[PDB]
Amino acid sequence: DEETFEEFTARYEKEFDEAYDLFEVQRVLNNCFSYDLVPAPAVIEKALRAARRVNDLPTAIRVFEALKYKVENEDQYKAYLDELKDVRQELGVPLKEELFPS
Amino acid sequence: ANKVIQLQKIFQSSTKPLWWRHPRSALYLYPFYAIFAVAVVTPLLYIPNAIRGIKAKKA
């Protein structure tokens, strides 16, 4: 791949839109977090809507666990949590830290 | 004298092992097992004299 970041996001948006079951959305999410970039907010949003279409709730929690493991800081994680807050509360998924508080 | 089809019809339509399927196999296979059975165990009888150091009689 000589891919730019924008070709990555436009590839994986339409890749998440064409997943049709739980094997495919988990597979596509796996091989989009297996790159050397945190995904853009738009493709994480598309991943959340795709896990909504297949009706699996822990994958939409594991999305946020994955980007917690994937970002460099905790303020990048909080920046994702800021403007991904509306889609997260609209879908109604909880983050793992507030679901299993230690 | 071109027995090859007649021998194909024996070797394919047979139950015996492949080295037994020819009619003349009892003439080869029964002496060979005796010659082989003495040929593999007679040096093993000389192994203890070779360990002890006893050479055979030549003079």
Binding site: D1, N31, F33, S34, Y35, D36, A66 | -
Partner: protein
């Protein structure tokens, strides 16, 4: 000159060959420790930061701009460690104008030395056999499996040429602090040189499997000043 208990380095040098061998070994060990530190640091940091990594970057396969670098960089470090090695190799081979020849013939489990220059007033060739002192006849203070009954005595600050052969099997005339190791094969005559820089006594051993007396086959070289060498040679 002699091994010491629990040692981990070379014996102390006595010739320029051995003191060059030590410097080449340390120069090689420098870059060897660089490479060892690199690969051990990578092998530590990778299994300590990716054992707890739950997402594997499974699309990293090529790396074109750095495969050429880790092909090229071992080659230039081979060139750097190979530059002094060739200089030492082509310095240690020349035996130019020696002031003494000594033949050393390995028989089965003794060495036989032969000064053959007729610089004596006797004018005859000097030979003797040097056997290991056996363990039951070691008088007190002697070094076990190293001391001999007769000795090879050599003057200092003298280019000496050792011509080495054998009589029945392959032996090895080897003294490490002088830095000579030379195979005694029963067909041919090899030569090495030395210049002993300090007086003393230097031990060595047969470093080639001769048979059942292979451990009992030592070399002992007393390097003295040239007056004392002459007064030793006047007897034998």
């Amino acid at each position: 000159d002699v091994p010491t208990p629990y040692a981990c380095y070379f014996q102390d040098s006595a010739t320029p060959n051995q003191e060059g061998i030590l410097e080449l070994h340390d120069n090689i060990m420098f870059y060897l420790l660089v490479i060892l530190g690199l690969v051990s640091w990578m092998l530590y940091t990778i299994v300590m930061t990716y054992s707890k990594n739950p997402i594997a970057y499974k699309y990293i396969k090529h790396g074109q701009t750095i495969e050429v670098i880790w092909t090229i960089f071992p080659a230039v470090i081979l060139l750097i460690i190979a530059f002094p090695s060739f200089i030492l190799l082509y310095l240690c081979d020349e035996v130019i104008s020696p002031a003494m020849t000594i033949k050393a013939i390995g028989y089965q489990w003794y060495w036989k030395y032969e000064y053959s220059d007729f610089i004596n007033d006797s004018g005859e060739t000097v030979e003797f056999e040097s056997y290991v002192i056996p363990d039951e006849l070691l008088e007190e203070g002697q070094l076990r499996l190293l001391d001999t009954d007769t000795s090879m005595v050599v003057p200092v600050d003298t280019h000496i040429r050792f011509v080495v052969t054998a009589a029945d099997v392959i032996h090895d005339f080897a003294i490490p602090s002088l830095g000579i190791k030379v195979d005694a094969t029963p067909g041919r005559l090899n030569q090495v040189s030395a210049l002993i820089q300090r007086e003393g006594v230097f031990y060595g051993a047969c470093s080639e499997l001769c048979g059942t007396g292979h451990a009992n086959m030592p070399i002992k070289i007393e390097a003295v000043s040239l007056p004392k060498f002459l007064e030793w040679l006047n007897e034998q």
